[PDB]
Amino acid sequence: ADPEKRKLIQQQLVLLLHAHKCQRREQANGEVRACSLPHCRTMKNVLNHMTHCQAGKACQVAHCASSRQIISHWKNCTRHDCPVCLPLKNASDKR
Amino acid sequence: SDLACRLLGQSMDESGLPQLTSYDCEVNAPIQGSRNLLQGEELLRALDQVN
Ligand SMILES: [Zn+2]
Ligand SMILES: [Zn+2]
Ligand SMILES: [Zn+2]
């Protein structure tokens, strides 16, 4: 393992969540684009692929192989404090 | 802006989007309990819980 690979994984996790958050929000209620992050469209394409594809371990695509893993982690993770899971589960900012 | 998105710039600075793999991700951040691959409908259901 490497700390900079963890940095890369952290942003992939957040971006993948944005892709669906953006989609969901836009469909539910919008006027001005829900989107903010440039890479969102890339993650939306990856998101679409993930649901259709069933190869997982065998899929040669970097994105597919990675994206399944990040969601698997977040879903299973019930740790006291994790650098992504914790802030996602319990958002520090509230209204 | 958004809570999850807090200083994305930190990691975004490194090229843009990396070429990570199942192996790399499994090694660096192991799935709690036992390793698996969350797939199909369950993906979208997991992504929905953010709201
Ligand atoms: Zn977006
Ligand atoms: Zn695939
Ligand atoms: Zn975790």
Swiss-Prot record, chain A:
Zn(2+) 2 binds at H49, C53, C59, C64. Part of a complex composed of MSX3, CREBBP/CBP AND EP300/p300; the interaction with MSX3 decreases histone acetylation activity. Interacts with DHX9 (via N-terminus); this interaction mediates association with RNA polymerase II holoenzyme and stimulates CREB-dependent transcriptional activation. Interacts (via transactivation domain and C-terminus) with PCNA; the interaction occurs on chromatin in UV-irradiated damaged cells. Found in a complex containing NCOA2; NCOA3; IKKA; IKKB and IKBKG. Probably part of a complex with HIF1A and EP300. The TAZ-type 1 domain interacts with HIF1A. Acetylates histones, giving a specific tag for transcriptional activation. Mediates acetylation of histone H3 at 'Lys-18' and 'Lys-27' (H3K18ac and H3K27ac, respectively). Also acetylates non-histone proteins, like DDX21, FBL, IRF2, MAFG, NCOA3, POLR1E/PAF53 and FOXO1. Binds specifically to phosphorylated CREB and enhances its transcriptional activity toward cAMP-responsive genes. Acts as a coactivator of ALX1. Acts as a circadian transcriptional coactivator which enhances the activity of the circadian transcriptional activators: NPAS2-BMAL1 and CLOCK-BMAL1 heterodimers. The lineage of its organism: Eukaryota, Metazoa, Chordata, Craniata, Vertebrata. Zn(2+) 1 binds at H18, C22, C35, C40. Methylation of the KIX domain by CARM1 blocks association with CREB. This results in the blockade of CREB signaling, and in activation of apoptotic response. It is found in: Cytoplasm; Nucleus. The chain holds residues 345 to 439 of 2441 of the full protein. This is Histone lysine acetyltransferase CREBBP. The gene is Crebbp. A zinc finger (TAZ-type) spans 2-88. Zn(2+) 3 binds at H73, C77, C82, C85.
Curated annotation (Swiss-Prot), chain B:
Expressed in most tissues with highest levels in kidney and heart. Overexpressed in the majority of common human cancers and their metastases, due to the presence of intratumoral hypoxia and as a result of mutations in genes encoding oncoproteins and tumor suppressors. A higher level expression seen in pituitary tumors as compared to the pituitary gland. The gene is HIF1A. The modification (3S)-3-hydroxyasparagine is found at N28. Contains two independent C-terminal transactivation domains, NTAD and CTAD, which function synergistically. Their transcriptional activity is repressed by an intervening inhibitory domain (ID). Changing N28A: Recruits CREBBP. No enhancement of CREBBP by Clioquinol in the presence of FIH1. No change in nuclear location nor on repression of transcriptional activity in the presence of histone deacetylase inhibitor. Functions as a master transcriptional regulator of the adaptive response to hypoxia. Under hypoxic conditions, activates the transcription of over 40 genes, including erythropoietin, glucose transporters, glycolytic enzymes, vascular endothelial growth factor, HILPDA, and other genes whose protein products increase oxygen delivery or facilitate metabolic adaptation to hypoxia. Plays an essential role in embryonic vascularization, tumor angiogenesis and pathophysiology of ischemic disease. (Microbial infection) Upon infection by human coronavirus SARS-CoV-2, is required for induction of glycolysis in monocytes and the consequent pro-inflammatory state. In monocytes, induces expression of ACE2 and cytokines such as IL1B, TNF, IL6, and interferons. Promotes human coronavirus SARS-CoV-2 replication and monocyte inflammatory response. Changing L20A: Inhibits interaction with EP300 and transactivation activity. This is Hypoxia-inducible factor 1-alpha. Residues 11-51 are annotated as: CTAD. The chain holds residues 776 to 826 of 826 of the full protein. It is found in: Cytoplasm; Nucleus; Nucleus speckle. Changing C25S: Abolishes hypoxia-inducible transcriptional activation of ctaD. Induction: Under reduced oxygen tension. Induced also by various receptor-mediated factors such as growth factors, cytokines, and circulatory factors such as PDGF, EGF, FGF2, IGF2, TGFB1, HGF, TNF, IL1B/interleukin-1 beta, angiotensin-2 and thrombin. However, this induction is less intense than that stimulated by hypoxia. Repressed by HIPK2 and LIMD1. The modification S-nitrosocysteine is found at C25.
